[PDB]
Symmetry: D2
């Protein structure tokens, strides 16, 4: 019943300020924090040996895209290795990012681990020595971090244990970060795996997020100094029923409206398997959703921003500009999407301002 301020007004100001710059109007996040083992699959996808040099070159390719991306990228999430690499001109990658108006982020979790006694569920590790790591990352250029928890929709999942444990570890991570001037991106990803429908995903997302925010409160987390990175609300990959982008958007915004306090500075959606186009189209529908949204609704895309670029590159320096052009096009596409004015391929009429309510009580 007694307060013991976790943060001073100055510390709050800094975190809030960082949080806002990242999701400023028209801006989103480039999630380029793939771990060595995760990026291996990407490189092998284009037949390229997973060496530090190729990774460095690939990250350079994205980080050094022309100034057209500047207004589209509020932040860039990097994997440890990349935070300490430099471009050809000798400039540290963090310097490259900042010179283009982007805030530098660092992934800090150490991957998922299995939860004994559950049906293949997990929690995430990475808290050991996290305070020291955050202080070091801060000194070396990072202003925000990312920690990913993973939940699965199944017959008996996500279980009460999985929900409770992942929410709690996310809160511990958030607390440590804020203690070190680092804005924590809270990512409670609910996988799209399965044949469940849209209603099921919405229900689970609502329950997971309510658990997440209660844990953040219990751990005295300063919400204005945080960002949420959730899954959009969609049917499972194996669901035979079909939905429009407008219904996906309605279910997503409805779920967020019932669980995310207005104080949360922004929601940066993960793309989780959606194609570049789909991810952009859904984000657009979300921002055009009639309902009131008290927070920025933007992106924190990995594959949805890199797919075509990685392919165009093919691991050949020769394809440098061709590759960057693909990334640039998706950056521009999603910048408009987070503003509610994106239209795939060709379309007449620029801003795409319109309205309509679909049922709204059916969710």
């Amino acid at each position: 019943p007694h307060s013991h301020p976790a943060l001073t007004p100055e510390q709050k100001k800094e975190l809030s300020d960082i949080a806002h710059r990242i999701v400023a109007p028209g801006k989103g996040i480039l999630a380029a924090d793939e771990s060595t083992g995760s990026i291996a699959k990407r490189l092998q996808s284009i037949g390229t040996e997973n060496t530090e040099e190729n990774r460095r070159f690939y990250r350079q390719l994205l980080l050094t895209a022309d100034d057209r991306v500047n207004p589209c990228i509020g932040g860039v999430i990097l994997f440890h290795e990349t935070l300490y690499q430099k471009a050809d001109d000798g400039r540290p990658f963090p310097q490259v990012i900042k010179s283009k108006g982007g805030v530098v982020g660092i992934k800090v979790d150490k991957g998922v681990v299995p939860l004994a006694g559950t049906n293949g569920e997990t929690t995430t590790q990475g808290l050991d020595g996290l305070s020291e790591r955050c202080a070091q990352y801060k000194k070396d250029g990072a202003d925000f971090a990312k920690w990913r928890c993973v939940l699965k929709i199944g017959e008996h999942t996500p279980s009460a244990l999985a929900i409770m444990e992942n929410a709690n570890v996310l809160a511990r991570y958030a607390s440590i970060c804020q203690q070190n001037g680092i804005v924590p991106i809270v990512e409670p990803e609910i996988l799209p795996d399965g044949d469940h429908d849209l209603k099921r995903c919405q229900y689970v997302t609502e329950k997971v997020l309510a658990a997440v925010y209660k844990a953040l409160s219990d751990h005295h987390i300063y919400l204005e100094g945080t960002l949420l990175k959730p899954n959009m609300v969609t049917p499972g990959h194996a669901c035979t029923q079909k939905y429009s982008h407008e219904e996906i958007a309605m279910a997503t915004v409805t779920a967020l409206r019932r669980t995310v306090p207005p104080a949360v500075t922004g929601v940066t959606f993960l793309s989780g398997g959606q194609s570049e186009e789909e991810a952009s189209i859904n984000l657009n529908a979300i921002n055009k959703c009639p309902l009131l949204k008290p927070w920025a609704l933007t992106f924190s895309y990995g594959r949805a921003l890199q797919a075509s670029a990685l392919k165009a590159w093919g691991g050949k320096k020769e394809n440098l500009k061709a590759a960057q052009e693909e990334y640039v096009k998706r950056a521009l596409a999603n910048s408009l999407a987070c503003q509610g004015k994106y239209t795939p391929s060709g379309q007449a009429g620029a801003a795409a301002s319109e309205s309509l309510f679909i049922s709204n009580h059916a969710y």
Copy 2:
């Protein structure tokens, strides 16, 4: 992790429509649901004996004020007895309320009871047979209900148990109401008693509200079909440090933004002992607060709407018009306050300047 819809789309629409009508722009709630023992004290402050006729008469006085209050009153909360009473023209009070554009509400809790093992803390009873009572109240004209839980700030309070139990019983009450077409007003009042400062009250309010919404989520409550009746955030009644109305508004709105999901249809503040003018001024400052507020911010005043009226009446039926006049004055003021367009004028008498604070079991 499996959904078992507590409500159909049709039931949701009805609850949502009801909640919105009660807090429509410029509209607030008149809380005239004082129990027999409670209203009795008010009658004594004016030397009026506590009889059924006197109570009926007093309630008629408020409910039959001139049509100027129509735009100001979205709902009226009544006590069981009054729900079945009639005005001088033979019309049941619910019919009177409705004919003036108001929604009829009914208080359904059965008072507070002590929580053993705590330092004078309580929870609230009233769930027994609540479903049947709600079904009956619905048929008799009521569309919303009210249930009051009480918490106190002290050295060891509110305790974890008090917070958890009160949040849980509020959720049970909300669940039963929604199953019967009644919109539940969730009232977790944190008393102003004590010498704590603004910060302390904000901290406790944030912790209490976080608990309330986690419980509502656990019990599958449809937030869009509910309203919240919290205490404004203010320093203790015995606190020496002075604060501006802008500070009170800042702390109140900040606490709500950090805990109340956008889906909640509206917040109807309890006056909790503030003078009529004080209550109106703070509500106005709250609506003028720069921060984004995704829910209607209005009033559900008892004392802050009846102070001068009771004084003007004095039990003498000759002062009927005099009394009603004072009531209309406060309804008009608060109607403007909930729109951030109120400016004191200089009237309301000294009766609106006096505080309506009442302790509990001496001190």
Copy 3:
């Protein structure tokens, strides 16, 4: 983190002594607290009109059984109506019970109610005015109470909500009881309904009891002044797999050892659908189980003690002695069973009890 003693050393002593008298060596509980609606099904099964007089005659039949039951019955649970009825000689039934060495008990819950948003799950009501009721019951001869919660094993049940809510209400009930000198019997019954196997029941029983005791701790319940009335751990009624009484006992005792604190004075099993003989055999096997059992393991049987007596009576006064003989026989059998001395034939000579091989690691 501060203690606010809910009970004085004197109140604790009273509650502890009551609880121990009820489950003293060789004693169990006669559960004759069937509500009028519930007892209607019993009277109808023997073609008997459900009148207050027949109910009185039947309760009288059980309560006035010869002195052989005296050392067998530590307590008798009564329904409100019966607590105020008198034997033919004019003696209040509570006096009749006490003169035979029994402690008087009273059922205080008001039945189950549906939990919205669940798959047919319930919680139990009855807290309203419970303190006043307990004070009156205490004054009128009762020293312990009974409150029944019901949970079901299904595809998605018992749900987290169901477990949490029922555990919480039982705690409130226990807290009120203790403030009035009444020893509360905590009954969280997991129905035998379904085709689940033995291990599934043990799993659920373990989780339910863990939640029950955490709630009792949160509400500051004095365990030494309470009794537990749980279901035995058995396969579902529709389960095809067959189990021995030794397996039922092992599963039951293991579940209890893993969740019930040693401070709990006693465990009084409900028969829940088992025949009179199987309920007795299992209780006996439970008491012979080769594991440390820090609490009395006895009975609180309804049908398992009344089945034959009811049928033998058939509503005919001429069958009084015959019906009472059937009750006394089961009372004697279970008295021996709660001591592990039950055999289809035994008095003052035994040396059996051979049970080799049972790897409790399989539980």
Copy 4:
């Protein structure tokens, strides 16, 4: 509500067998797991350099005492470094411990870390990569582990967050340990620091342990395959009021009976600042306590088994025999104590209980 066996019958047996061996009758644990930082203060107290060799020598001094300690020591906890050191005869310490009939334990936590927003409270880290570490330790001779959480009695401590978080991390540690065949000793130490009295310590201990066991249940922990290392219930080290050993013993046994499920194999008390004698006297009084104790009540002492040994050594190799003598002396004393067969008054041993005085309802 659905089981997903965390362990197989074989895994359960292994853990249970290990836990039982450690606490077999008359056996206790030697806690020599002081980290470099903690052991440094031990050597410094006796003016000895904190080199690897001196640490290896001191540990050798304790681990190679004569066979008289064999019946007294069921297990020995080591710090990482020591687990990989060897005695003068070339035998690795794990082999030395085992050849004397002891089970080898390994401390696996990575120290406490501050919980932001609390009044100097902490949680403990060390879960990262714990599974792989456990698998390696098992291969290298360890069969059980230790993890220490620290809580403190203060004005507003232990807080709800501190209790919840420490209970949760202990559960995570226990879960990982059991997946690797390692018996986890759960240590939720409530410090003796402060001027609080016996009642307060008993209250906090009861609340802490209830939280610990609910967390263990939520995480599907196999209690029979665990040990509990709690603080005895005592007044604060600076408490003005004074108590007797019998009062400490009653408070301790009562707190445990109200929270520790019978299924827990054993309770190994930490000495927490108590002198060698006091720790032995209290453990004796605990085992002599009239109340029923369903678990072994033994010791896991560090300072209480090493105080005199370290002092007699002084860092001089010629004081080997004298130092070991002091340790054997305390080992013998405590071995008798964990059986309630220890008498102080010098080298005595021919006295039993005396002075009849029940009144245990005062706790």
